[PDB]
Write a protein that binds this ligand. Sequence first.
Ligand SMILES: Cc1cc2nc3c(=O)[nH]c(=O)nc-3n(C[C@H](O)[C@H](O)[C@H](O)COP(=O)(O)OP(=O)(O)OC[C@H]3O[C@@H](n4cnc5c(N)ncnc54)[C@H](O)[C@@H]3O)c2cc1C
Ligand SMILES: Cc1cc2nc3c(=O)[nH]c(=O)nc-3n(C[C@H](O)[C@H](O)[C@H](O)COP(=O)(O)OP(=O)(O)OC[C@H]3O[C@@H](n4cnc5c(N)ncnc54)[C@H](O)[C@@H]3O)c2cc1C
Ligand code: NA
Ligand code: NA
Lengths: 422, 421
Amino acid sequence: LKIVIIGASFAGISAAIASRKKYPQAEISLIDKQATVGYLSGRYITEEELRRQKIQLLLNREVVAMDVENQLIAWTRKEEQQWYSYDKLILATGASQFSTQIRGSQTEKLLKYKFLSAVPLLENSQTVAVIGAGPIGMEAIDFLVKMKKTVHVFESLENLLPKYFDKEMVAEVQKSLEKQAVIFHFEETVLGIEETANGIVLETSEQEISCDSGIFALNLHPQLAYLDKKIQRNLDQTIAVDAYLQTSVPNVFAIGDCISVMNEPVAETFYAPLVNNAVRTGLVVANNLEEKTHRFIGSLRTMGTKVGDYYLASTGLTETEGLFFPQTLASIIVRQPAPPLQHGTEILGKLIYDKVTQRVLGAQLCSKNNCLEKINTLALSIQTGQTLTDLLQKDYFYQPSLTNIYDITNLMGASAYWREND
Amino acid sequence: SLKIVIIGASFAGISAAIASRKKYPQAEISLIDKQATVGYLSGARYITEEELRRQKIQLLLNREVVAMDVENQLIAWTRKEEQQWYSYDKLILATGASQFSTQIRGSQTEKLLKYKFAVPLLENSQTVAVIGAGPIGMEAIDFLVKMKKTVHVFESLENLLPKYFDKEMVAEVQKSLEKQAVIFHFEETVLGIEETANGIVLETSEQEISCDSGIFALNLHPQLAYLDKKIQRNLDQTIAVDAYLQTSVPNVFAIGDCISVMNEPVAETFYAPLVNNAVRTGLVVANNLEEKTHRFIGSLRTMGTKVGDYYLASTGLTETEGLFFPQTLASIIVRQPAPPHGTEILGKLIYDKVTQRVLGAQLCSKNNCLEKINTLALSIQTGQTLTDLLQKDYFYQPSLTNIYDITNLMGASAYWRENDE
Ligand SMILES: Cc1cc2nc3c(=O)[nH]c(=O)nc-3n(C[C@H](O)[C@H](O)[C@H](O)COP(=O)(O)OP(=O)(O)OC[C@H]3O[C@@H](n4cnc5c(N)ncnc54)[C@H](O)[C@@H]3O)c2cc1C
Ligand SMILES: Cc1cc2nc3c(=O)[nH]c(=O)nc-3n(C[C@H](O)[C@H](O)[C@H](O)COP(=O)(O)OP(=O)(O)OC[C@H]3O[C@@H](n4cnc5c(N)ncnc54)[C@H](O)[C@@H]3O)c2cc1C
Ligand code: NA
Ligand code: NA
């Protein structure tokens, strides 16, 4: 069996490794347009580790073409094209193509994040623009605040990390950052950028702002030129796959940032470019290369980070995006002093559930205490179809010096349950 | 005007009271307890009488229930050596763990202390004995080591926290304590205790050990003398209940420590007097006083603690516990350095070899990863397979987690390992 994987990153390396365990005999090739793979960027595994695991790393080769019916792909190394055949093809190409509707976005003064590899332009900057307040955006605001720069943040949605939190859950986080030369512009889109000799002017749907330079923190898209046209694609240009991560054509699969994941209990498609989706989809394709053995469970955009002094975690549907779903969403917020027997710092928890079915659909957490791991529990609760009643009584552990009497996770479900009984 | 009466104003009882109020804003709710005060911890106030009072919860303290009549629905208590009767529409039994019970000869010695019932007897002792290496015993040892006493630990099972960990998982914690004058006697049961003028001698299945005093760290049982003999009970004396927490008689329910809980997947009925079992059964029973609406999920004996520099957590069946079940169980150990190069996180996963259903987990590390046990517990209690655990959602962030969560990894490792075979 010849398993060929295009993309030697999180998704691809996971698929490679997972494939090696399933098929100890199979010939496995990992292809990538880079000099070396194995490290995080802007060193979790060594080429020797892939090698010890009988995985051929064909680097410096950029895939440029495909032939689905003859089952071949073509890469271009040292100016010379070369075709390669496959029995199974796994697309783990990620998303790095910069595609915007911003006029004059090709300014060298507008840094495109992932390509980051601090930098002269930023150090010589006093005021910097950040386009996008998603996870990538907040990371940039963080490093810019450390460098003591003035920051202008542009976000089309209502609040910071909009796809993960509802306004009230991060209102304090924003104020916190506002006291640190961070200036927010929500519900404002960057329409164009004028390059001056010593800076840039962001032309938004509301005004013009001056900055010395800018960081593009919006989600990039999959560079899928090499893609065979017979392969079904989604409107947003991601590759369409079924619950087994197979493309619309025989012997070709796609994982990670290539595809659009699904939040099943609410059967809706969305693009969640996260490391956990990359690792999970990769480990799973490996068991569906010949037979539809294990359905991908889907994604809930589960995330956890730290913005300043605040630990923030999120998973599932936000109440805000509930306007676009059939479920009648309801929510409750719980405040409970941190685990040292309710004496510690406040922990804010929001739970989103279906008001009719009482199924848990989303959760948000904000605190100065690092309780982030609880998001993995809340995520599991939603992913297994629990109701307020189930969450309310799930097992949890108590220890007078380590926890509170009743876990905030269980309490979130109970509080919602009680409120639903008037 | 439903009159709900709750005997026992502790974790279980107070939870039932709170929950009963939520469900019945217009109900008469009485909380009865033989103590003077309520809402204090043990082992500094988690609820004030003023609080329960504000929720219209009739606090009837200094009253000890000594009898009840199921047929006519009444209970009787002794206040100031004068009996009194009280009626109820719904009665919730939430008394706790008090009764001292053991077949040890001479256990009546005054030199053998019962944990929970700076002590003179212990400070005058240089060598103290602890009977039981369960959670209660591990705390006594902790207390004793801090007082710099020499400790002799007796445990019928194979290792410390036997109902929570298999031998290899706590081997380093044992050595850790043995450097602090703790001497362990596993697979050794105390048969009798001889009292001397200045100490005790413990007759064991293997030898005789001298100590100045001893601590009984075995689980105490519910004081159910007042119980109407009409209520069905288990062999260990706990009160039997159906999935909705009702006893075998009309309008009487039992929760917390009076009760035995279940691990449905393996059809195991056991006694696990834990605060989490007390609180959950208390909140659930309040919804089944009339119609059976919500089945109590049961318990996995989920636990988390810290011994020395070690954080230990457990949930479900240990490999050793599994040997007691017909179903064949397997396990795998996973060592993952903590995030970002950090200290080792050691986890063991127990699963059904045939169905690949996750059934138990154990964690040990110098890193506080205990919360991960709540997640593993949810995986088991929810019926996940190794495959489900392998791909469950988890969050990643370079400064806080590893690339692939150890919880997911433990499931994947078992899956892959099973594939090799
Ligand atoms: C600044 C930033 C911060 C982020 N922070 C987080 C975070 O904190 N937590 C989190 O979960 N996620 C985070 N992400 C998202 C995460 O990095 C992605 O979800 C993840 O990289 C996806 O993995 P992948 O393997 O699918 O794609 P990639 O990691 O992009 O790998 C794809 C590989 O394919 C190769 N390739 C592409 N096209 C071709 C071709 N035509 N021919 C040959 N090879 C090709 C590339 O060289 C690349 O190595 C962040 C992203 C950015 C940009
Ligand atoms: C040393 C020690 C350490 C422990 N550590 C932990 C731990 O770390 N984590 C954990 O989860 N659990 C721990 N536990 C167990 C935990 O304390 C119990 O599971 C919990 O207290 C049970 O709650 P309950 O409300 O059912 O009973 P209890 O808390 O025992 O309360 C019963 C109440 O009923 C009253 N009562 C009894 N009889 C009568 C009567 N006849 N009439 C009127 N009132 C009566 C009593 O006054 C008492 O207040 C520990 C126990 C001990 C001894
Ligand atoms: Na909706
Ligand atoms: Na067995």
